[PDB]
Every structure is written in C-alpha cells, then in structure tokens.
Amino acid sequence: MRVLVTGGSGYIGSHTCVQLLQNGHDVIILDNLCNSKRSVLPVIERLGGKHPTFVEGDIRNEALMTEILHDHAIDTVIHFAGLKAVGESVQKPLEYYDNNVNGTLRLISAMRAANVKNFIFSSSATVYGDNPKIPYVESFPTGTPQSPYGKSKLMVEQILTDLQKAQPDWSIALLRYFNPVGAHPSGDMGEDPQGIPNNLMPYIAQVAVGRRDSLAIFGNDYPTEDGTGVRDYIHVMDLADGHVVAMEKLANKPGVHIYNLGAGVGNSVLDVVNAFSKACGKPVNYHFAPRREGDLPAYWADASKADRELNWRVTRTLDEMAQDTWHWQSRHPQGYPD
Amino acid sequence: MRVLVTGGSGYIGSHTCVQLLQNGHDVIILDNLCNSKRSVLPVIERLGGKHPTFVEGDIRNEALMTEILHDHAIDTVIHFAGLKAVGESVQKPLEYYDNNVNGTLRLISAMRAANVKNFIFSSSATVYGDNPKIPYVESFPTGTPQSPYGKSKLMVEQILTDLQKAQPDWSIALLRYFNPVGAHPSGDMGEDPQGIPNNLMPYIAQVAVGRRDSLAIFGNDYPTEDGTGVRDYIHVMDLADGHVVAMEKLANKPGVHIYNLGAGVGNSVLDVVNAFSKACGKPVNYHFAPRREGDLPAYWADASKADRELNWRVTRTLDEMAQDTWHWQSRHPQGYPD
Ligand SMILES: NC(=O)c1ccc[n+]([C@@H]2O[C@H](COP(=O)([O-])OP(=O)(O)OC[C@H]3O[C@@H](n4cnc5c(N)ncnc54)[C@H](O)[C@@H]3O)[C@@H](O)[C@H]2O)c1
Numbered sequence: 078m079r080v081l082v083t084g085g086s087g088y089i090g091s092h093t094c095v096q097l098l099q100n101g102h103d104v105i106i107l108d109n110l111c112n113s114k115r116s117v118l119p120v121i122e123r124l125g126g127k128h129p130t131f132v133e134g135d136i137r138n139e140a141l142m143t144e145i146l147h148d149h150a151i152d153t154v155i156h157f158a159g160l161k162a163v164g165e166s167v168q169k170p171l172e173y174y175d176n177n178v179n180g181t182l183r184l185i186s187a188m189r190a191a192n193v194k195n196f197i198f199s200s201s202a203t204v205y206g207d208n209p210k211i212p213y214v215e216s217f218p219t220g221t222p223q224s225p226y227g228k229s230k231l232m233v234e235q236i237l238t239d240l241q242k243a244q245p246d247w248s249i250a251l252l253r254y255f256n257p258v259g260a261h262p263s264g265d266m267g268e269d270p271q272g273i274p275n276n277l278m279p280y281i282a283q284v285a286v287g288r289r290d291s292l293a294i295f296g297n298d299y300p301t302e303d304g305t306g307v308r309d310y311i312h313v314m315d316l317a318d319g320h321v322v323a324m325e326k327l328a329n330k331p332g333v334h335i336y337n338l339g340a341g342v343g344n345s346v347l348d349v350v351n352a353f354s355k356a357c358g359k360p361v362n363y364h365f366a367p368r369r370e371g372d373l374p375a376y377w378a379d380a381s382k383a384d385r386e387l388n389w390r391v392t393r394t395l396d397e398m399a400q401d402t403w404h405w406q407s408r409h410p411q412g413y414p415d
Numbered sequence: 416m417r418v419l420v421t422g423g424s425g426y427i428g429s430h431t432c433v434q435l436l437q438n439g440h441d442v443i444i445l446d447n448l449c450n451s452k453r454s455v456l457p458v459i460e461r462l463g464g465k466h467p468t469f470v471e472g473d474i475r476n477e478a479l480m481t482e483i484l485h486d487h488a489i490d491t492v493i494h495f496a497g498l499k500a501v502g503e504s505v506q507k508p509l510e511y512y513d514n515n516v517n518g519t520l521r522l523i524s525a526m527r528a529a530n531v532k533n534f535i536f537s538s539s540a541t542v543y544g545d546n547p548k549i550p551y552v553e554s555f556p557t558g559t560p561q562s563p564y565g566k567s568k569l570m571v572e573q574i575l576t577d578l579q580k581a582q583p584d585w586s587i588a589l590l591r592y593f594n595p596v597g598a599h600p601s602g603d604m605g606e607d608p609q610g611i612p613n614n615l616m617p618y619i620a621q622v623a624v625g626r627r628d629s630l631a632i633f634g635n636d637y638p639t640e641d642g643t644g645v646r647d648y649i650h651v652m653d654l655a656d657g658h659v660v661a662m663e664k665l666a667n668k669p670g671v672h673i674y675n676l677g678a679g680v681g682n683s684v685l686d687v688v689n690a691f692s693k694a695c696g697k698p699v700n701y702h703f704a705p706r707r708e709g710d711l712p713a714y715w716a717d718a719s720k721a722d723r724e725l726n727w728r729v730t731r732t733l734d735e736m737a738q739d740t741w742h743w744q745s746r747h748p749q750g751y752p753d
Pocket residue numbers: 083084085086087088089090107108109110111112113134135136137156157158159160161176180199200201202254255256257276
C-alpha cells in the first residue's frame with residue numbers, strides 16, 4: 078500500500094518505516110525535524126531495504142498535506158508526528174495543543190480534501206486517566222489525562238471519533254501505546270533524545286554509557302511489590318510490527334478500531350534497572366528520590382483484543398529491550414550525526 | 416477599558432457591545448460575518464451611543480489577531496465567535512473543531528504574542544454533560560458533552576485552564592451560558608438566524624409571525640411537570656450585562672473564574688409557548704413530536720456564585736423575554752437588511 082507516515086523520522090516512526098518497507102509498502106515520510114535528524118533516513122532505507130520518499134514539512138500546513146496526499150496517491154496515513162514531553166506540556170500547553178490537536182486536525186482535513194480515508198493514530202494509555210482498574214481494557218470509558226499532553230491525545234481520539242461518525246467510510250485505528258523502549262536489533266537505529274531524557278530506559282542508558290551519574294528512582298513507597306512504579310514496557314520493534322498489521326488488516330474496514338498495544342504485563346523500575354545492569358555488564362548506578370508529580374503507581378495493558386482481532390502479540394522480552402537499547406547506545410553514543 | 420469583542424456582530428455579542436459602549440468602554444469588533452450582517456453595526460452604535468470599530472476577519476488568522484491586539488492596545492478580549500449549530504456539528508465535526516478549538520487557540524496565541532492577558536469565553540451548560548444533579552453548580556466536575564459542538568466547548572475550557580496555569584498572570588472567565596433568548600428592548604436588535612431556527616424561542620417567533628405552520632414540541636413524556644423539556648432561559652440583555660460586569664471586575668484578577676450565567680430556574684416548552692402566545696396576542700400553533708436526539712429532560716443553573724462574587728443576577732422575566740422577541744420579530748420580519 079502507499080502510506081504517508083508523519084513523524085516517520087522519529088523514534089517509533091523510523092522503526093515502523095523499516096518494517097513497512099520490509100513488507101514492500103511504498104513509504105512517504107513527512108517530518109518537520111523538530112525532534113529528529115535527516116541522518117536517520119539513509120539508515121531507514123538500508124535497514125528497510127527499500128527507498129522511502131522524504132518530505133520535510135509540518136502537519137499543520139494543510140495545503141502541503143493535501144498536496145502530498147494527492148501527489149503520492151496515498152491509501153493510508155500513519156500519524157506519529159506531534160510533541161510528547163509531558164513536563165514541557167505543563168509548561169507550554171499551547172504548543173502541545175497546536176501541534177497535536179490542531180496538527181492532527183489540519184492533517185485529517187487534508188485527507189478529506191484528497192479523499193484519503195484510512196488512518197492510524199499514535200495514542201496513549203494516558204487516555205485512560207486515573208483508572209484504579211488494571212489492566213486497562215479498551216472497553217473502559219476514558220478518564221481525565223493529567224497533562225496537556227495527555228489531554229491533547231484524548232481530544233484527538235474524540236475528534237477522530239466524531240469524524241468517523243460523519244464520514245462512515247473511514248477506517249481509523251486508535252493505537253494506545255504503553256511504554257515504548259528498545260531499538261532495532263542491528264544497533265544502528267534507536268531512540269535519540271536531545272538533552273535530558275524524560276523516560277526511564279534512555280535515562281538508564283545514559284547513566285550506563287557514563288553520561289550521567291545516577292538514576293533517580295522517582296518514588297519507592299508505592300503500593301507495589303518492590304515500592305517502585307510498575308509499567309508495561311514494549312519493544313519498539315513489536316510496536317512497529319503492530320502498526321504494519323493494523324494498517325494491513327484495517328484498511329478499508331470502516332470503523333474506529335481501538336487497540337491497546339502493550340506486552341500485557343507490568344515491570345517495576347527496579348526490574349528494568351536490573352535488566353539493564355545485566356545487559357551492559359555493570360551495575361547501573363541509582364538512588365531513590367521523591368515521587369514525580371502526576372505519576373501513577375502501577376498499570377499495564379490488557380492486550381487480548383489485539384491478539385484476538387489482529388492476531389498480534391509482542392514477541393520481544395524485557396531483556397531484549399534492554400540489550401537492544403544498550404547496543405545502540407553503545408554503538409552510537411552521539412546518536413545520529415548532524 | 417479597550418476591548419476586542421470577537422463575534423461582536425452576532426446575537427449575543429451585538430447586545431454586549433451595546434452595553435459595553437453604554438458603559439463608556441472602547442470597543443473593537445472582530446467578526447467574519449459568516450453568521451451575521453454588517454447592517455447590525457449602525458444599530459450597535461446607535462443603541463450603544465458610541466462608535467465601535469469594526470474589523471472583518473477570522474479568529475483563525477493569528478497574524479491578524481495579533482495585529483489588531485497591538486494596534487488597538489486591547490486590555491481584554493471577549494470571545495463570542497465560533498459555530499454553534501448542534502445538529503450541524505454532528506454532521507460536520509471538523510468545521511466545529513476548527514472554528515472553536517483551533518479558532519480559540521489561534522486567538523489566545525495572538526494574545527500571548529501581544530501580551531494581552533484578560534479573557535472572557537462564551538462557554539455552555541453543555542460542559543456539564545449528562546448530569547443527573549440539578550441545578551448545575553460550578554463545583555461539579557464536567558461531564559461528556561454529546562455533540563462535537565459541546566465537546567469543542569469543553570476542550571476550550573480545558574486548554575484555557577492549562578494556559579492559565581502556565582501563565583499565571585492571566586485572568587480568564589469561563590462563562591457558562593444556559594438558553595439565551597430575548598432582544599434589545601427597542602425592538603431594533605435581536606437574534607436573526609438564517610434558515611430554520613434550531614432553538615425554541617425564534618422557532619416559536621417564526622410560527623407566530625406566520626412563517627411556519629406549527630411548533631414541533633420535541634417530546635411530551637419527559638419526567639417533568641407537564642411532560643415537556645425544562646430549561647433555564649435567560650434574557651440576552653441580562654447575559655450582556657453579566658459580560659460587562661465580569662469584564663470590569665475580573666480584569667487583572669489572576670485566575671480561571673467560572674460562572675454559570677442563568678436565571679436559576681427552569682421553564683418548560685409549554686411555559687415558553689404560553690408566554691409567547693400572551694406576548695403576540697394569539698395562540699401559538701404547536702403539536703407534539705418525538706423527542707429530539709441528545710436532548711436532556713430538565714436542567715437549569717444554580718447562579719448563586721455569580722450573585723455572590725459579581726453581584727450579578729438576572730433582572731428580566733420570561734414574559735419580557737417573549738415580549739421583546741416578538742417586538743423585534745414583528746418590527747423586523749426580514750431581520751437585518753442585506
Ligand atoms: N515514546 C513514547 O513514550 C510514547 C508513548 C505514547 C504515545 N507516543 C506518541 O507516539 C508518536 C511517536 O513518538 P516518538 O517516541 O517516536 O516521538 P518522536 O519525537 O521520536 O517522533 C515524533 C516525530 O514528530 C516530528 N514532528 C513533531 N511535530 C511535528 C509537526 N508539527 N509536523 C511534523 N513533524 C512533526 C518530530 O520531528 C519527530 O521526528 C508521538 O505522537 C508520541 O506522542 C509515544
């Protein structure tokens with residue numbers, strides 16, 4: 078199929094582009110490079126084994142979006158582009174609402190214009206809000222995200238939903254991601270955050286590479302087995318595979334298809350640190366700090382629905398996630414070149 | 416004060432502009448005329464007793480918004496512009512999210528740019544969602560609006576809220592309107608909907624003027640005193656007065672000030688019809704039809720908060736509301752001239 082992948086040069090997108098190309102789809106990447114570098118492109122094509130076309134630009138430019146859609150006779154769009162720094166979203170809300178809400182709105186508006194009616198959206202478990210019921214199941218009604226970031230994600234799911242209702246021929250997948258981690262097995266592609274990483278695995282990786290002193294474990298008095306926060310981590314490669322499958326099987330299947338994409342099990346901060354210590358050959362330094370604001374104690378996904386309906390489940394393990402991350406970190410300590 | 420009134424040529428805005436001018440404020444109206452005519456301008460100035468400056472343009476044009484804000488040294492902005500047809504929003508969601516969500520976002524983004532930090536937003540009781548508790552009090556957590564229109568309104572309250580948190584010096588009023596009706600006492604300004612009116616009072620007015628055959632009373636088996644829907648109707652002139660007061664007293668008062676603006680009591684469809692029959696001198700024709708989709712049975716506002724904090728309460732009665740509407744309808748059966 079002909080697929081426009083917005084945000085395709087980013088962490089999740091890049092990996093999905095590789096898998097998509099491997100499956101012989103024709104890929105057009107649209108990215109504004111605010112959070113990635115063009116240097117990943119050649120790696121995508123090399124690992125993907127096929128050339129993806131790149132367009133530098135912004136989802137907020139509806140005229141441009143429409144043109145690209147027509148120009149490349151796109152059949153489906155996978156929308157990864159947007160801003161995702163939680164803390165920053167609290168500090169700079171407008172930028173999050175503009176990039177994510179308006180951003181998606183302009184993009185689907187262009188779709189409408191170009192008659193494209195297959196969409197896949199990067200959503201998040203944040204949409205479940207403060208749910209005491211765990212694991213989270215797609216049948217639960219959504220809650221109230223606590224950051225502008227989370228809210229922006231739920232707002233898009235809602236706009237997408239109403240759109241589908243008004244244009245019943247569209248197929249729209251709402252893919253709720255849990256905690257993505259890991260890197261391509263070759264060690265040549267991975268997450269390349271700039272500055273202080275906000276997430277656990279890259280932070281740990283930077284501590285391990287010798288960039289940072291110690292990992293601050295936010296909180297150690299949670300009502301969990303070891304006192305540390307519990308989440309569901311999923312390898313970026315499994316996530317990527319899930320996007321290809323969802324794109325392939327839901328195309329032209331009218332409806333709003335909501336799927337949690339997770340491993341279906343939780344791991345605590347210590348579990349993750351321990352796996353990384355083992356992958357890198359040395360104990361990861363860390364200490365306990367206070368709980369981070371807005372942090373829930375424990376949650377993971379119920380991913381039976383996607384197993385049942387899409388025949389998709391994760392196949393990589395936590396140890397792989399850590400190993401693969403270390404291999405990339407270690408092979409490319411400066412990330413992608415400028 | 417120097418005030419930009421977006422949507423100022425519309426029903427509610429026009430009336431508020433008149434009151435604002437009467438209080439000696441300097442008014443700049445920004446309107447795209449998608450739902451009003453320039454012919455109201457001269458009436459505003461005449462009834463307002465002072466000239467308001469008019470700018471034809473769209474809230475979605477952030478560059479223009481910023482310019483106007485700077486150019487007129489605006490101190491506060493009252494935001495009435497947007498789309499409000501509920502049923503249409505179900506049919507055309509994107510247009511509602513673009514005009515209302517993106518629309519407001521571009522507008523406050525321009526404010527940020529021009530250093531303007533006092534805002535008043537036209538919100539709605541729709542934000543309370545399907546609340547069994549009535550009357551609705553600002554202390555209730557919001558619910559889930561059932562139309563794209565309602566959702567768009569709640570999304571804006573949320574974005575506004577996060578913005579204020581990030582820019583604590585702003586004063587933002589969230590004015591939740593109930594059911595506005597009525598017209599200026601002179602009979603020369605009023606609501607001038609194009610096509611089939613979606614709301615009760617103008618529909619009744621058109622039936623009375625001889626334009627329509629009979630009023631369809633949506634539903635007659637509600638758990639109410641007479642079987643018909645119950646709402647809180649408020650005269651547009653009281654609503655207008657409330658906006659001047661809120662603007663005057665909340666300016667430069669940091670915070671997100673949420674106020675319900677209603678009469679604080681409910682009236683059924685029959686009560687309204689009966690008042691209109693009495694105002695127009697003839698029985699209004701009507702019949703019972705099925706319930707309209709998404710219609711709640713009975714609700715009204717608890718307006719004690721605004722009484723307490725702003726010393727504002729309604730002063731016009733239901734009979735006035737009907738009388739004033741008939742007087743305008745009857746004096747200007749073709750509305751404002753093209
Ligand atoms: N990584 C996570 O932990 C996480 C979990 C939940 C959901 N998500 C969502 O998944 C998607 C992918 O996240 P990621 O980890 O790969 O992040 P990323 O930062 O690596 O990729 C985002 C891509 O979007 C581009 N972009 C941003 N705004 C744009 C705009 N207006 N126009 C065009 N391109 C723009 C960036 O330059 C970037 O390459 C994002 O929507 C994110 O919110 C990710």
